[PDB]
């Protein structure tokens, strides 16, 4: 009808947020775009090593296994049982 605005474009046409800065979606991939691992590449290292793990999803925690080795520094403890070696 109006004449006037059309209840105003940059508020009606307010889906100028199907473009805007909507890296609210988009650029949640292009930070994971570089994602890891180690990070990145190498060392530590392309599986497996993995199967299993950073990332997948899922789930699930996660840990696990001390962080390591308590035990398995040969064996553990330690300086380094003792225990007996």
């Amino acid at each position: 009808g109006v004449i006037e605005e059309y209840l105003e474009k940059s508020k009606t046409n307010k889906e100028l947020n199907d473009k805007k800065r909507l890296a609210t979606t988009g650029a949640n991939f292009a930070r994971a775009y570089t994602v890891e691992f180690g990070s990145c590449k190498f060392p530590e290292n392309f599986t497996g090593c993995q199967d299993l793990a950073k990332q997948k999803k899922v789930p699930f925690l996660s840990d696990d296994l001390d962080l390591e080795c308590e035990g398995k520094d040969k064996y553990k403890c330690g300086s380094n049982v003792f225990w007996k070696w």
Partner: protein, 115 residues
């Protein structure tokens, strides 16, 4: 109907799906993971097993549109006998099970094979 007639195709049919669940690896499901890289998935972005509609429509009717008559071809185009096969029906049933009822892709050893 048929009967008896609907085994050979069942034969070839499951064979490929059974073939899916053996020569695979796999890679999703997920579940457990994460369920749903290439592009991401490239895979359209989400929900697209309805090409199957067309596709699983496009083979079976396209098989039978057969029938030798086959019409479906067409004009042109340029725009103990259940004992045998039916025990065979079982041993193909079966090794869906163990090929699924634990993980295959074991890959537990033994040694190593690549690596």
């Amino acid at each position: 109907w048929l009967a008896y007639g609907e085994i050979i195709n069942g034969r070839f049919a499951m064979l490929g799906a059974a073939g899916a669940i053996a020569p695979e690896i796999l890679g999703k499901a997920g579940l457990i993971p994460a369920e749903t890289t290439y592009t991401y998935w490239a895979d359209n972005y989400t929900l697209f097993v309805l090409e199957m509609a067309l596709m699983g429509f496009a083979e079976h009717r396209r098989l039978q549109d057969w029938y030798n008559p086959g019409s479906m071809g067409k004009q042109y185009f340029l725009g103990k006998e259940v004992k045998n096969g039916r025990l065979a029906m079982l041993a193909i049933l079966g090794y869906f099970i163990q090929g699924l009822v634990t993980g295959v892709g074991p890959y537990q050893n033994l040694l190593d094979h690549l690596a």
